[PDB]
């Protein structure tokens, strides 16, 4: 994992990190299945195009690649609104 810096932003009512893209994996999809770890491998080369799109037009909101394996890689990184069970409530968000 990565521990990001999370500056606070406008045009986002939250804290964003313009260094790397965040990943969302549905609650009941294991992160480590060879199918999921492969998406997290070849998607790692999206972050530079995310960055250059953003610095070409500083008024972009979320950019997201939502893939057929449940993952969703969005930019700029920002912690998801519902953690799995760190709060009491579950998140049921499936990008598909």
């Amino acid at each position: 994992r990565i521990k990001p810096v999370f500056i606070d932003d406008a045009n986002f009512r939250r804290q964003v990190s313009y260094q790397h893209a965040a990943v969302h994996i549905p609650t009941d999809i294991y992160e480590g299945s060879t199918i999921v770890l492969n998406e997290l491998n070849w998607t790692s080369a999206l972050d530079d195009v995310f960055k250059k799109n953003r610095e070409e037009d500083p008024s972009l909101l979320w950019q997201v690649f939502g893939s057929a394996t449940g993952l969703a890689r969005y930019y700029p990184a920002s912690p998801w609104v519902d953690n799995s069970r760190t709060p009491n409530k579950i998140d049921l968000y499936d990008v598909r």
Partner: protein
């Protein structure tokens, strides 16, 4: 989930079979208490 590589992570259980009342549980590869792996455990199970 039918193999030990699959049975990892969390999953939902539904209280009262209600699709809108769910709980997160970690899924784990359990081994029945009374089994038939060796001849001692087989004799135990056949005893019970």
């Amino acid at each position: 989930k039918m193999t030990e590589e699959e049975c990892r992570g969390y999953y939902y259980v539904y209280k009262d079979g209600d699709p809108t009342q769910m709980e997160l549980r970690p899924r784990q590869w359990i081994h029945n208490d009374f089994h038939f792996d060796n001849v001692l455990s087989a004799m135990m199970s056949l005893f019970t």
